[PDB]
Amino acid sequence: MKQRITVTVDSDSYQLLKAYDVNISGLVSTTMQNEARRLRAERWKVENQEGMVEVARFIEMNGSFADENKDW
Amino acid sequence: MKQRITVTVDSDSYQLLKAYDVNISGLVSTTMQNEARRLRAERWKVENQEGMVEVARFIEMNGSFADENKDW
């Protein structure tokens, strides 16, 4: 069978991601796999932060691109 | 008005999170806000499946506690 899990966004941030990469629906269940794997009843944290992205800072920014071709 | 993002999981990991924390739908859009600001998603889904969490016995179930638990 299947389970329809739907977060009615438009107001929530979902739109932002899909607004620039409407490839999250799958992500939804993916973001869980991570929170799922790590899921094991007991879970600590307190304070975690080291490297941020790598071990200094990298990432790549092109500027400001939406995600639509529009009409022309 | 609103946008219905429906990731019919049941098979996907979504269920894994709701199975032990059915507090993701709203979360979905949250994970986006972070992936929205930073707008730097990633591509790395699953490869194959297992089809056996353990190996002993696990016939059709209806539920009892949490969502898919037994006792503790």
Contact at 8 Å (CB) between B33 and A11? no
Distances, alpha carbon B38 to alpha carbons A61, A62, B25, B31, in Å: 10, 12, 21, 11
Answer whether A26 touches B (CB < 8 Å).
yes
| CA–CA min distance B17, chain A (Å) | 6
Instruction: Please give the single-letter amino acid code of residue B36.
Output: A
The pair of structure tokens assigned to B21 is: 């924390």
Answer whether B20 touches A (CB < 8 Å).
yes
Instruction: Please give the single-letter amino acid code of residue B7.
Output: V
Q: What are phi and psi of A53, to 5 degrees?
A: -110, -45
Contact at 8 Å (CB) between B12 and A26? yes
Which residue in chain B has the smallest CA separation from A2?
Answer: B10
CA atoms within 13 A on the CB side of A42: 0
Distance between CA atoms of A47 and B25, rounded to whole angstroms? 26
Distance between CA atoms of A25 and B29, rounded to whole angstroms? 10
User: Which 3 state secondary structure label does DSSP give A4?
Assistant: strand
Contact at 8 Å (CB) between B3 and A10? yes
Residue A6, beta-bridge partner list: B6
| CA–CA min distance B61, chain A (Å) | 14
Domain ranges of chain B: 1-72
The pair of structure tokens assigned to A8 is: 């009615």
Structure determined by: NMR
Distance between CA atoms of A33 and B24, rounded to whole angstroms? 12
Q: What does the DSSP assignment read for B10-39?
A: SSSTHHHHHTTT---HHHHHHHHHHHHHS-
